[PDB]
Amino acid sequence: TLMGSLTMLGKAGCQWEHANTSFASFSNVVACNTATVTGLASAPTEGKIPGIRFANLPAGDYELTVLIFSMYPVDAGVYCRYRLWDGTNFSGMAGAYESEIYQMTGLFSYATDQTNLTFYVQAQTLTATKNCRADITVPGQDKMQIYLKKL
Amino acid sequence: TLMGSLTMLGKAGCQWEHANTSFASFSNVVACNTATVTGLASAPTEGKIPGIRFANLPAGDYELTVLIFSMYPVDAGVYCRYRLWDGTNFSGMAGAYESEIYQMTGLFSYATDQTNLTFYVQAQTLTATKNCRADITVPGQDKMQIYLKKL
Amino acid sequence: STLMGSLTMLGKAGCQWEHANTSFASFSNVVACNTATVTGLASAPTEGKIPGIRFANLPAGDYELTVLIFSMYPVDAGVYCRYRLWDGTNFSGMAGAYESEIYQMTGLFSYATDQTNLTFYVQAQTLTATKNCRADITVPGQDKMQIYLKKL
């Protein structure tokens, strides 16, 4: 069932955020721990970000789960939408407003074998200049686990 | 294993609500898109609602997942309870108060093969006349994905 | 079957667990709670009627642990509580609450070798000393707790 997984332990400085009003992925942050991967999974070519890469994935139905402590809008009074994104399709949209997100789940289907397939956490802020954040800065506490189940 | 799935893409006017103080399913809204189904799944006989039907389902243990952006109480100051319901048992109860639900998960088991088995999202308001809502009115942003896994 | 086992506890007046540990801690036995119902490999935790599930044995592999519970929350306004799933060695599925509730937790756990006497716990931590974090299933016919482990 487990196609692959990716685990990133918290580390000072490992915080992703942007104020894009359109959905956008996060980008590499040098301070992050390298993620440990298993199975068919690898780090995204974009580097240390909330995401997971499958160089090869067979046709089929998949459930993607992101466990992250945690994601939230940085400022009060700001609404942030988050989604899981494979470059083409999205699933598992969620929102945060003076609140946090700790888990996202998405359903994805492929009729043909995939190559170089990356799943991303994306976010959009509903107030320009106000950031949406994914935060694993506290060692020993914060953690991200991403894993893909073949159904 | 993925027993079946049901996907409805968002569309203006496709929102469900009621103000029942007893748990109740939502009812057909004609503006909604026709859902697409895979595997053993079909649309509820009640029509375009948050739910999924299995004309036949083997004995077994099953995890039901509902991904939906989004469900919320229409008015501020109003508490809404939501549950997953198979006609006999409930699972995965959640609440909302000036807040949203994006996902629901339930565990259901059957000792014998089932026929005409429908799973429903149900809701109950804690203030009469004040509605609980499920809302997929924004095309390209909102979507409902319901799927059942055999454990 | 990938369902290694499950544990179910139906709501009952007085079945509420709470503490104010500033460090992550499990809950302890509450006498007013219903006894749990279990399936598969699972058993009730040796600590008693608590948010948790026990696996007297579990083969090496990868597992997803789900807790469905209506509900967990900080007792007081203005207090932040963290919850996490714990197997005595590692944690997963950390969640938080603040004038809000938790209804589901999910964790990913892996074992390179066969496990014996393995218990999974819901643990909590308050960020305001002396202010309780609670798991509440005191309403009969409405509240309940379902815990289950799936082999991946």
Author numbering:
A (entry chain A), B (entry chain C): 693 to 843
C (entry chain B): 692 to 843
Paper passage:
Proteomic and structural analyses of vesicle contents reveal several fibre-like proteins, which we name the mosaic adhesive trimer (MAT) superfamily, and show localization on the predator surface before prey encounter. Using independent but complementary approaches, we identified and characterized a MAT superfamily of trimeric fibre proteins with diverse adhesive tips, able to fulfil the long-sought-after role of multiplicity of molecular recognition and handling of diverse epitopes (across a wide prey range), by the bacterial predator B. bacteriovorus.
We next characterized two more divergent NS74s, Bd2439 and Bd2734, obtaining a tip-only variant of Bd2734 (residues T691–L843, 1.8 Å) and a longer construct of Bd2439 (G837–D1107, 1.6 Å). The Bd2734 tip represents a divergent TNF fold, with large pockets between monomers. Superimposing with a Burkholderia lectin–fucose complex shows how the Bd2734 pocket can accommodate a terminal monosaccharide. We found that Bd2740–mCherry did locate to the CpoBBd0635-containing vesicle, deposited during predatory invasion, while Bd1334–mCherry and Bd2734–mCherry fluorescence were diffuse throughout the B. bacteriovorus cell. Bd2734 and Bd2740 are two of the shorter MAT fibres (843 and 627 aa, respectively), which are relevant given that one of the short MATs we were unable to crystallize (Bd2872, 626 aa) was previously identified in a screen for predation-deficient mutants.
